[PDB]
Amino acid sequence: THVLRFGGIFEYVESGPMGAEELAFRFAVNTINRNRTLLPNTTLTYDTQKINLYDSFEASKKACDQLSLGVAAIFGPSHSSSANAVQSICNALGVPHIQTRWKHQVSDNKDSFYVSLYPDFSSLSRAILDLVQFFKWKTVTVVYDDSTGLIRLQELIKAPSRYNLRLKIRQLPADTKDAKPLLKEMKRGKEFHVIFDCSHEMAAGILKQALAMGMMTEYYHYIFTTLDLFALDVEPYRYSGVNMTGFRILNTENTQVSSIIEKWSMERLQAPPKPDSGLLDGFMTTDAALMYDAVHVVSVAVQQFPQMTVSSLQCNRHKPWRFGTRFMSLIKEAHWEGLTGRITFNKTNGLRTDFDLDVISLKEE
Amino acid sequence: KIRQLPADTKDAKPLLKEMKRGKEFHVIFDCSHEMAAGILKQALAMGMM
């Protein structure tokens, strides 16, 4: 068959031999090999290299190896430093890097050959800000994880310049899990309305230790900002009467999407997690859905581009890829109905700032 | 103000909801400690701790 060889650079998550991201990438390339509408005349084989965590130099060496193998895009990684390295190893050689998680963008960067797919956190923070204006708040308390900075919460921070807010910023203890003295100072300082900012494992941790601190009452109100709020387990907090709201980007109410959530978690392709942790079981998390959608929309851009072959690209030494610039215009131009919603990029800077959210909240059911 | 634990179960969530909605703060429980642990777990899940 006609050959096309994507590539992935994934990170060593030791819950199994393959993390959720690489599981989603291999599962997704299997379903696009199988569906004979999306690319019936080609075959997506894929070269997947697995790097350690926080290794910019190992990532780049791996990516130059993939580019030597000859590749037609590069998916992942998800950490900011290694992602930045491989994004410029691509911007150089002219192959489309397709991010999946939110990297920290350097504003002076002139890289044109990248497409992010996590919804851009400026526009997502505008959504958080419209929730803050809708609940008519004054005394917000942003609580951010220090794995990233405030740079993605720049719109919440620039918010009290142009509104009437009082936004006290506090920082989670990054080295540990127990948020006990933070939550104690939060309760003592009467900081009721709290915007969290953390990955959903951290969100389950702070919710459990907010329950044991007794900060789960009628008063408190936790706007989460991870897109995995629905994959929390709200069974211990369902009755207390917290209004914890948050955003959801998966199309779980659509049938063709929920069938693939089921086909994901009906044989435990998703790795079996710790059920005593606090997040639920048998779900497709947002990162896995985003990687699924990533290789879907890149497959679409291959279908709009017939004659494109895959060229041997010698790293740290030579030309750009020939077909890559037309290919990259095609990926940025591409449009897809996927599990994340619709998918179309802001065609200037490659980010994704046009999408449908779903404001979910905790009611008694 | 007297109220009564439903003895045929430990599903005292409607009683705890009535005590919360009626703003009954100070409570003298009267039960054996198995029922006391049960009602304490229920009142944690009810958010009255």
Next chain:
Amino acid sequence: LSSLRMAAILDDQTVCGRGERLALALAREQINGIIEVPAKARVEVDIFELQRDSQYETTDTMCQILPKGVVSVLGPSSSPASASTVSHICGEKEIPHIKVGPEETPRLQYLRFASVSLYPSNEDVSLAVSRILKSFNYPSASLICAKAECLLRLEELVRGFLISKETLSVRMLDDSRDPTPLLKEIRDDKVSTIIIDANASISHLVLRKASELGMTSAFYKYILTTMDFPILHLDGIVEDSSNILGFSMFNTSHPFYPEFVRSLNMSWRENCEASTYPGPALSAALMFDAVHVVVSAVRELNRSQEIGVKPLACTSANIWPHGTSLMNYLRMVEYDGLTGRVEFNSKGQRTNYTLRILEKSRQGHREIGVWYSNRTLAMNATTLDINLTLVVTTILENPYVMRRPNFQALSGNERFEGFCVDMLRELAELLRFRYRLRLVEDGLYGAPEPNGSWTGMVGELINRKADLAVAAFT
């Protein structure tokens, strides 16, 4: 023990450069000019330029330097992404990094700490601006970050303040690099202290349009957080009282500093005649202190054992054998150079160093004291500059202040006669300060009124129009 090779990675331009080539050539000149006994390890420093800030090209440059038998790398000056690539490459090859640049990347501890940093920490500069604002008695300040990275560089300042429009409101310059709308929001939002974060040219544009808005007189206190402050030139904005603070890191008592600035002054004119030489770039001084720190620590290493330098390759993973030992000998060293003291704590940051604080004065700068690494700030070391004719408003009511025959100069002298006129005459004749009269704006004594402010002469005082309202106000 052949010699001491090093690596310079630069982010300057050949013409009108910040001058890192001249700095490191001057430094190699100086430490080769030290005549030790015996004819010991003659220091060379290799220049490796780096055109655009891009992690791929940095990786190419680093891959060239590692086989050249480097003992420690330093630079790049003003490219943070290139700095992070250099840092992780040399941290996996155990070549010591000496970061002369700032930290705009989110620094993670899982990225290993094989990287000392001569440039003071973002957390330290944030603590310095927070202690300056404490010693202004916490005024309702306002940041003007040039780029989003300001929030990373001032993380501790932002999260140590209740972000609102009365304690700290953060405003960010837009893609246009024009500061007038957010300066206008600052003016009519009634805020005084303006913390400007940016490089020299963008802070220059903000302060120039701040003067061309009228916000430069002694009401406004500007705190510039560029540690490349004193190379600025605010001619036309340097006023009689302008409160333009700033930080600086030069022990100008240093015995090399005048010939340092003289050599860079000469080699600026020769390289380009674009403008005057604005003073030494902090990155140039930091590169001088950097190569001195490397030479002192490696001479301490060679004084205790023998060092060995082997040409490493980017492909394979030959770790340098003396990585942790040179890291300990680096993070123990103390230097006394063109950034004050160079002593490092455990993490490889900098401590026991003194930030001079400058104020933009008549021709250049004039200190408001120092801010130390640990302890608080002595705002009175040169002197504490809290110490930084009048207008006489009157109604015209007979017989208290009666108008004279209004043909001659009825202003100052002839403006009236009567008990008020001689009253203010004798009053400031005693209190010895000249003040010119002016008839009132409304003609009523005025009332505190329901349009927000007062009416008449009351509002004429209250809106700070004139100075002393010396007339029969009840």
